[PDB]
Structure formats: structure tokens, C-alpha cells
Structure 1
Amino acid sequence: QALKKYTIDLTERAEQGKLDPVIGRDEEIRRTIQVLQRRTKNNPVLIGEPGVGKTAIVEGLAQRIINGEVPEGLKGRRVLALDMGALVAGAKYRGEFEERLKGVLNDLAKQEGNVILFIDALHTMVGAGKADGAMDAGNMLKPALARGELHCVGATTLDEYRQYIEKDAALERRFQKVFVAEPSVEDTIAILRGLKERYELHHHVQITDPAIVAAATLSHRYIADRQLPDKAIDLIDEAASSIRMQIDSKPEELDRLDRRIIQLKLEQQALMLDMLNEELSDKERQYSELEEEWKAEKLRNKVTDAEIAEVLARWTGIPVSRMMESEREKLLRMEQELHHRVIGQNEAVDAVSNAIRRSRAGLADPNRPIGSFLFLGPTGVGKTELCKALANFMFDSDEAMVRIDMSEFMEKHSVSRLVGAPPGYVGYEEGGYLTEAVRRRPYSVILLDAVEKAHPDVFNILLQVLDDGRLTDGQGRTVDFRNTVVIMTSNLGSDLIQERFGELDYAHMKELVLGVVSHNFRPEFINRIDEVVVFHPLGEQHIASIAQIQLKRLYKRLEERGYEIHISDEALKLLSENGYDPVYGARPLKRAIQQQIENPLAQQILSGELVPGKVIRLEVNEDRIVAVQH
């Protein structure tokens, strides 16, 4: 035959026990049955976005025919899947393809209409082997489709339907559109209960029903491209795979320490100054201790919701995994941890620590982004440093953040360069700078330093960002900002803030500067911002702490240069008295440090004077501070 050589029976596969259990979807399978029992146009197409069970609708109809859960006219119908690549794959000569296809047609006509043809990927029916001698299989099925002779079940995607079928009008009326809806969440739960039984008996593991309902809710929550019930299933199967690797080999922390100790063993072999044997000793001791603890319980045999959280955190980036104790104990000290790079300004430090704790605890607003802040302070009191300290806490990295400074955006133009050009224009297929780089890594920090410089109607983009956290670039798609931490820094009233931070409380200062911002913004915008903090300048103690931190990073640079240098404690007082001005904050301190330390230091190092390893002190002169060699 030809049906033996170009089709695959689905009902055979359903009777041989190969196909999945297919749950729900009741109205669309009833409607596919309705379209298949006609006189002309026996041809349903299953339109839905890619991943919503269209192949599962067809294979479930096949299973219902096998179980006899169908009406009477469908009993005995062999549902056949056509392989169109099988038809194309041999017609090297002219006319061989059409012989193949018409032999298929004659055998289907001989089968008395008892075969429901299923063509997966109906966009691969146009362009099925046309050439100069074009018959295409579209212009051959078409008088057999229109006369209802052929019961072709289509299954095509939605953006492929417009491109490859609705650019051929005589074929698009042969088929009938069954708009498959993406399911709900509870329907996804039921679908995962049937497929729970399937993936349990495959991966030899067990899936608790909270792991299912957690996979459903969280994959609805935290994934922007893919759809239910695809991504839910993938989380379940990958959690099962991870548990199978845990059960087969050893737990993951054993593997972390094992690969790190073999790494450091290779590196200490490669050291043949070290500062490596301490780390190897720590890791080998801890690996032996945790191996003994694994022998004590001789870590899992099931799949829980925290497992789904581990996979979803390894899936997007967003920290949904439940708190290990190192992370949580690091997280409690967040107010303390910021004050190793931002000394002073306790207001927004405590505020932002509260914000990220509201995120990690789980009480965030799940429709609005985490951080919606408006920093306000005089020039050089660490606003940009507070945000870079946030990047350093949150990603172990200083310069890993989205810094889109409005200081280029001084016109209504540059809305385009944050959300991409609309179609037909120049950089259309490059997207926005912002929405691309939030579609890559959703969990991040948007930073808008010098936010008042922009033309005042750029912020309407941020009306969208703070209402819902969805932004629509030029390519029509939505990039979901509901994990981003939007921070804006300005100085709209810093004369007033340097003038009246004394003799007024924090509350009335926030009140008055918020009135100033209301003069500079609109009530639409400022009603979105969660907390608009006020920053004060930095007195002498903060200046001394900043001087200490900058001399720490100076010694930290000079350690690779190889010069461990001390300081006079009086020289700190000379830096304080030579860097003190309460109108510019902390940068005159830094450039006074720059001059009055580095210029004798770079003078004497470039002099051919200093040898590494020497005890070097920053002794003072009567006015100078010089480096001595001891």
C-alpha cells in the first residue's frame, strides 16, 4: 500500500499503550467531532498558541475512539498521522511525488471513509514538494477536501497559520478553525495529575500533590514566553530528573564540594603567593563532615514544592528557592550589610532592606514590581553607591545592573531608544534596549540616575512600569517587570535639603520636598512610587568612614602592586580637615585624598625609590603627608 508506507496509525498507538492520558479539553474535542461529521469540509484545524495541547487533543480523540467514548459513527475509524516529510523525501524525478500523493488518495477512497487523516503541522502542507513542476500537495488535496472525501485533522500554530495558510485563500476555506484556549490553572492541575502518574512510573520517583499545584501556580507566575500546560510539565519532569540524579549518584552539595576540591587540587598542582591551601583545607574538612552527615542518614526520595522552587530558580533566575541558612542569615543583616559600602543614610538603607525582605518573604504585590523608589539627595551622598551596593548584595557583583541614566533622555525622542522602534523603521529588529535586557534576566535592578534631567514626559513609560510592570516594545511583545527593582535618584530640592535638614524632622522634610517634586512631576507618576526618601549630607564621622573605605580600596589596589602601606592616625585628621565641605558631600574628600596622597606616592614609586614588602607609613609633615620607607 501507500498508507502502510507513508502514514502512522495513532489508534494503533493508543491501543498498544503508547500515547499519553488526555484530560479535560471537552468542548474542543466535541467540536472536532462535530466538524469531522459533516458532508463537505470534513476538516478541522486546531489553532492555539504553541504548547497548549493540540497534538494532545488529536491523540486524546484517538484514545476516546479506542475506548469507545465517542458517538456511533466514529466507532472503528482508524486515525492516521501523515508524515509529509515521508512524502517529500524521495521525489528526485518529476512526477514521483504526485504519484505518491495520489496513491494515498486512492487508498483513502478505497477505505470507505473510515480513516480520519491527521496532519500535524498543517503549514507543512503548502510547500510539500512543489518545484517548477509545482503541485505542492495543496493543489492536490483541495478538490478532495472541498468535496468532503478526506477527513484531514489539521494542527497548526497561530503565527504559522497567518503566514503559511492565510497567504493561500483557497485552502483556508477548506478547514474550520478550532481556537484552542490556553487552559486555566486548575485545569493545568488536573492535567498534571494524570501526567503525574505517567512521569512517576517513568522516573521511579514520587510527586506530591503540593509539588504539582506549586508547579502550576509558580509557572503561571514566573515565565513570560512559554505557556501552560507545557512549562508545568517541564518543571515536573526536570524535578524528577534532578531527583533521579540525587538518588543515583549523591546529593548536590556533595557534588559541589567534590568538584571544588578536585578543582583546587588541580590548581595547587598548578602552583608548582599561594593562598590556596586554606581554601582546600576548609573545603576538604567540610566535605568530610557533610559526607559523614550523609552517612548518618544512610537526601530525598520524592519531589516537593521546594524542589520545584529550586528548578524554577535555575530556570529564570528569580530566587524562589526556600531560604538556605547562609542566604537567610545574610539576608537578615541587610541593614548591616549595606553599611560596609554605604555608611550613613540609614533611612533608605532600612527602607530598601525592608523592600527586599518583603520580596523574599513572599508578601510582595504580585502585580507590581518589588522596588519602586525615588531617592533624593544632594550631590554626592551615595545614591548611586546605594544602588551599586544593592547590586553587590543581590548579585555578588558591582557592575551587574541595568543603569539607564535619564541624562541622555533630554527629549521626547528617546522613548524610542528605551522601547525600540515601531515597525517599518530603522532599528525595528533590534528591540528596545530596556525590554530586551529585561527579557534576558528578569530579576535585576533598573537604575535611573539623574532622573530630573529628562524631558518630563518620558516617565509615562514608567507609569506603565509601576502600574503593572509590563512594557510593550516595538515588536508588540510584553516584557514583564514584576521582579525588577526600579530605583530613581534625583536632587530636585537639594538646596532646600542642605538648608533645612536641621531644625525640622524627617517627616516634614519629606513633606516639603514632596511638594517640590509635585511641582516638578505629575500626580500620576508620584502616586506610583512606594517610598520617596530624602538624603542628608555627611558630617565628619561619615567623612572619616568614607576616607577609611577609600584607603582600603587604595591598599587593595596596591597589594597587587605589592606595597603594604600604613598611615598616621593624624593623617586621617589632615584628610578630614582637607576634605571637609558640607555643600558637595563626599567627592571633594576623594579628590583631596587623590592629590594629597597619591601624588607623593606616585611621585616616589615612579622615582625609582620604593621596593615591595617595605613597611611604608603615611607620616605627616607640618602640612604635607609623605611616605616613608621602613
Structure 2
Amino acid sequence: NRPIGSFLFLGPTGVGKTELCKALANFMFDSDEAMVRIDMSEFMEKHSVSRLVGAPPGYVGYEEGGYLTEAVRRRPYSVILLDAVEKAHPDVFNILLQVLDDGRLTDGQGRTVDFRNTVVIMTSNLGSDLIQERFGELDYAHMKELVLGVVSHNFRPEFINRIDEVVVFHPLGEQHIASIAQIQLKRLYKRLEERGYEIHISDEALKLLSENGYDPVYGARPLKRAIQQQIENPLAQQILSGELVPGKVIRLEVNEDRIVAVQH
């Protein structure tokens, strides 16, 4: 009688929340863009209720339903992402009270689309102050309790009765970000091998990127745009010369203060 699992993730941004959800979808179907993603930060007024569940009889777009009950009448085993849900108009969640109580849903035309094989995931980012304040020297449990009280300030007490487990994230350490950088260089090797260039890297350049992209306060995206600038710009610079012969081992080796490529 309840859907499979209904989780409220927390944290500061850029730590992997959306990636956990997309990792689930890219596991469960081998696709990021086969899921249901309702961008809940749009819902700053009380209308988009009537875009997700449909508009009642005697109104405009009647015979095409909401967005949610369409594609969960279609594919009964999906995994919903409701990202950034803390910026909705704070009573859009009563729709979600039905959704997480039983996972039937009274739509426009009346047909109770049934959710109970579809993972509701909510991902907020309320955990800025509290997690950046006291993730050090605290356990998982008291953090969960205290930010749970914080969300009780924000949401309704009606609501977190429903949520299956409110798992709370932590900011990243440096070695984590080095592994992130490993993954980013793997996807770069992916994007450039499709274009056709064998590229290696100085392993020291990993450490220079660790010196580059690290800050504990913004999550993993500073690493990403540091990779963007301080790798791609000399790379796509020298590519557009016609300089880089395909087939050569393009080892990304460090400069004195930068990273350079070789053609050997």
C-alpha cells in the first residue's frame, strides 16, 4: 500500500544527489533520460499542481491530463525525481501526501493511476548551514535528528511522517574529489575517443587539479569547471589548429603552472 521507497535527501549542492538518482536510472534502465523528473522549483505558485495532476473537467487542457499521471499510467516502474522541492510553494506537498500515503492519485479524468512500483525520491538542498556547521565531530544520527528538526521547521509535521528514510549528505574530502576527477577524465576520454584522439595524462596533473578544484564549500562543480577551463581550453585550442594528429599518444603533461599536451 505504499510506494517502494520515498526518500528525502539533503545537503549542500553539488555533492551527488541528482547523480545518485541518475545513477539509479542509468542502472535500472541504462538511461538517465528514462525516469520522471518533476522540476519542483518551478512550482512557486499554486497552479502547477494543476499541471502535474491535470486540469479538471470544464477547463482548458482537459483531455491530456497532468504530466505525472500520463507517464506513470504508461510506464508503471519508473523512478521519480522531484528535485529542489524546498522552493515549491510550501503547500504543493499535499498532492504528495496522497502520493506517499498510498500512491494512487485522483487525476483529472478520474482514473486512479497507481504509483506503488515507482520510487519517489525527493532531493532538497536545505542542508547548507547545519551540515557545513557541524558535520565535523558529529555522528550520522544526531545530524539526522537536528536537520530533521530543521525540515520540521520548514515543511509540515504531516509530511515527514510519510517519508521512508531521510538520508542526509556530507561535504566531500579531497581524495573523494580526486576520484571524481578520475571519473571526469574517464568521460573526457569517452567524448574525445568518439572524435578519435588517444589521450593520456600526467598523474601529477591529477594532484595539480586537486590543488585547483578543491574547496569544501561548493561541492564538486568547482572541480568540474576547473577541469573545463584548465584542461579543455588549451586542449580545444590546440585541436582547432589542425595540430593534433589523430593516433598520437596525447599525454596531458604538466607545465610549470599549467597542463600541456604532447604529439608523440
On whether the aligned pair clears a TM of 0.5, the verdict is yes
Cα distance between partner residues in 2 of 1:442 and 1:601? 45
Q: CA deviation at 1:493?
A: 2.9
Deviations 1:213-263 (A, max 9, x none): xxxxxxxxxxxxxxxxxxxxxxxxxxxxxxxxxxxxxxxxxxxxxxxxxxx
Deviations 1:540-572 (A, max 9, x none): 111001000010010011111110111001100
Q: CA deviation at 1:431?
A: 0.5
Cα distance between partner residues in 1 of 2:102 and 2:140? 30
Where do residues 190-209 of structure 1 align in structure 2 (5 Å cutoff)? none
Cα distance between partner residues in 2 of 1:400 and 1:371? 18
Q: CA deviation at 1:407?
A: 1.2
Deviations 1:22-57 (A, max 9, x none): xxxxxxxxxxxxxxxxxxxxxxxxxxxxxxxxxxxx
- Determine the structure 1 residue equivalent to 2:90: 456
Give the secondary-structure state (helix, strand or coil) at the position aligned to 2:256: coil
Cα distance between partner residues in 2 of 1:554 and 1:505? 36
Cα distance between partner residues in 2 of 1:618 and 1:610? 12
Give the secondary-structure state (helix, strand or coil) at the position aligned to 1:619: strand
Specify every segment of 5 or more residues in structure 1 that has no aligned partner in the other structure, as ranges.
1-366
Q: CA deviation at 1:622?
A: 1.1
Deviations 1:276-322 (A, max 9, x none): xxxxxxxxxxxxxxxxxxxxxxxxxxxxxxxxxxxxxxxxxxxxxxx
TM-score by length of 2: 0.99
Q: CA deviation at 1:446?
A: 0.8
Q: CA deviation at 1:460?
A: 0.4
- Determine the structure 1 residue equivalent to 2:59: 425
Q: Does 1:616 align with 2:246?
A: no
Q: CA deviation at 1:608?
A: 1.4
Greater relative contact order (CA < 8 Å, ≥ 6 in sequence): 2
Q: CA deviation at 1:585?
A: 0.6
Give the secondary-structure state (helix, strand or coil) at the position aligned to 2:199: coil
Cα distance between partner residues in 2 of 1:583 and 1:533? 20
- Determine the structure 1 residue equivalent to 2:150: 516
Cα distance between partner residues in 1 of 2:27 and 2:112? 28
Give the structure with the higher percent helix: 1
Cα distance between partner residues in 2 of 1:574 and 1:378? 25
Return the match for 1:626 from 247, 260, 263: 260
Cα distance between partner residues in 1 of 2:179 and 2:245? 30
Give the secondary-structure state (helix, strand or coil) at the position aligned to 1:498: helix
Cα distance between partner residues in 1 of 2:3 and 2:136? 34
Cα distance between partner residues in 2 of 1:493 and 1:564? 41
Cα distance between partner residues in 1 of 2:234 and 2:129? 36
- Determine the structure 2 residue equivalent to 1:597: 231
Specify every segment of 5 or more residues in structure 2 that has no aligned partner in the other structure, as ranges.
none
Cα distance between partner residues in 1 of 2:134 and 2:256? 37
Q: CA deviation at 1:481?
A: 0.5
- Determine the structure 1 residue equivalent to 2:125: 491
Where do residues 117-516 of structure 1 align in structure 2 (5 Å cutoff)? 367-516=1-150
Q: CA deviation at 1:413?
A: 1.2
Q: Deviating runs (4+, > 6 A) in structure 1?
A: none
Give the secondary-structure state (helix, strand or coil) at the position aligned to 1:566: strand
- Determine the structure 2 residue equivalent to 1:266: none
Cα distance between partner residues in 2 of 1:481 and 1:398? 20
- Please tell me whether Structure 1 or Structure 2 has the larger radius of gyration of its CA atoms: 1
Q: CA RMSD in A?
A: 0.7
Give the secondary-structure state (helix, strand or coil) at the position aligned to 1:561: coil
Cα distance between partner residues in 1 of 2:167 and 2:132? 15
Cα distance between partner residues in 2 of 1:629 and 1:371? 52
TM-score by length of 1: 0.42
Cα distance between partner residues in 1 of 2:220 and 2:126? 19
Cα distance between partner residues in 2 of 1:413 and 1:400? 26
Cα distance between partner residues in 2 of 1:537 and 1:405? 24
Give the secondary-structure state (helix, strand or coil) at the position aligned to 2:86: coil
Q: CA deviation at 1:419?
A: 0.7
Give the secondary-structure state (helix, strand or coil) at the position aligned to 2:189: helix
Give the secondary-structure state (helix, strand or coil) at the position aligned to 1:607: coil
Cα distance between partner residues in 2 of 1:437 and 1:404? 12
- Determine the structure 1 residue equivalent to 2:208: 574
Give the secondary-structure state (helix, strand or coil) at the position aligned to 1:525: coil
Cα distance between partner residues in 2 of 1:418 and 1:437? 11
Q: Between the two proteins, what is the percent identity of the paired residues?
A: 100
Q: CA deviation at 1:370?
A: 0.3
Cα distance between partner residues in 2 of 1:468 and 1:406? 21
Q: CA deviation at 1:579?
A: 0.2
